[PDB]
Amino acid sequence: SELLLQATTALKQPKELGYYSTNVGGELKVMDESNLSYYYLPDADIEKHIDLSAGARKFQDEQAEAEDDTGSLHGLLQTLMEYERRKSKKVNADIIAFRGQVKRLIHCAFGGHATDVDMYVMSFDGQLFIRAARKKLEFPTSPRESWAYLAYYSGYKFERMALLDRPVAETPREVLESRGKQVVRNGPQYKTVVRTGVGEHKLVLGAEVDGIFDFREPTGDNLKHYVELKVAKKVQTLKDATNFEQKLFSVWLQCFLVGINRVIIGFRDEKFVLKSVEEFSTSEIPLLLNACVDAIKWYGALTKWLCELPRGPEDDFKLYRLSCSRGALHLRQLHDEDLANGDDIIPGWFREWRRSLS
């Protein structure tokens, strides 16, 4: 099947189903907020001219050095199982995926690289499970003082300088006075798991969350308290403005998909010094920027298209490659027994869980 990249539709309010904390090296803690950080970046720290390139040489990159399947649904599925177990009921949804993959599908109609839409779709138990085909991320391999390396590292340094492991009230003075000494890491992650929808279809999406902005509600839905952080170059030219608009569009997509309302941008100069930080509401972004309106209509279209795939009992473990080329998304059914029978897309333990649940 194909769907051409060129229909009015409404969004459902996303609801948080659960969350989990992970790291490379096999750490997975389901329904556990250990790795959830808290925003804290006083103006007095910013006024001292934070160098976002500081520490690039001494950085120990956990993600880059791990051999791990970055597309795996295993953490998401373990969290979903725990949610379903507590409820005694299969989640009501059509598609289960990571937010980043759905973002890629949306973005490929609006400037994204067609070449790297590469996903597996598997039907199981009335639902579609979608994962990135590739198992390894691309990390910059240029020297650490290269622009490409600093662009990558600066994101993590900004997070370490703007975030705390716990609320400010629970943080010792020693840490608050010496933010630049704290070790920069990209291993620990915290993800939310959200039920969302567009048009008449529903999705469960996993999504990385950078932190809590204001406070957390221990017994509530925290989507409204989450914040995503991004580093952008301060705008001083046409070229900078265009790059920033594209970054704004991208972070808007990331937040809107899972009901996050808060974005913080760290503006850097050409020397990677943080110049200022600005809060944006997710809703502010389309106003500032019809790409956003059309992206939601495209989201609706592509989701309705995927949901045409057969999802009855006889379709269990059928597998399709999802791609983008010649101005269209494409679905091609595969016949790969090991890949379909192995644990790479839907692991045996989750199959067993859903069977028992039936």
- Residue 326 annotated in ligand binding: no
- Residue 2 annotated in ligand binding: no
- Residue 247 annotated in ligand binding: no
> What phi, psi does 346 have (nearest 5°)?
-125, 110
Rounded to whole angstroms, how far apart are CA atoms 189 and 9?
33
Please state the separation of Cα 83 from the chain's center in Å. Answer: 20
- Residue 84 annotated in ligand binding: no
First-last CA distance in the chain: 31
- Residue 174 annotated in ligand binding: no
Rounded to whole angstroms, how far apart are CA atoms 148 and 191?
26
- Residue 210 annotated in ligand binding: yes
Give start and end residues of each alpha helix (H) in 257-290: 284-288
- Residue 135 annotated in ligand binding: no
For CA atoms 172, 176, 179, 185, give the dihedral sign.
positive
Are the CB atoms for 337 and 317 separated by under 8 Å? no
Rounded to whole angstroms, how far apart are CA atoms 43 and 356?
54
Rounded to whole angstroms, how far apart are CA atoms 168 and 164?
7
Task: Compute the C-alpha angle 143/144/146, nearest 5°.
Answer: 70
- Residue 105 annotated in ligand binding: no
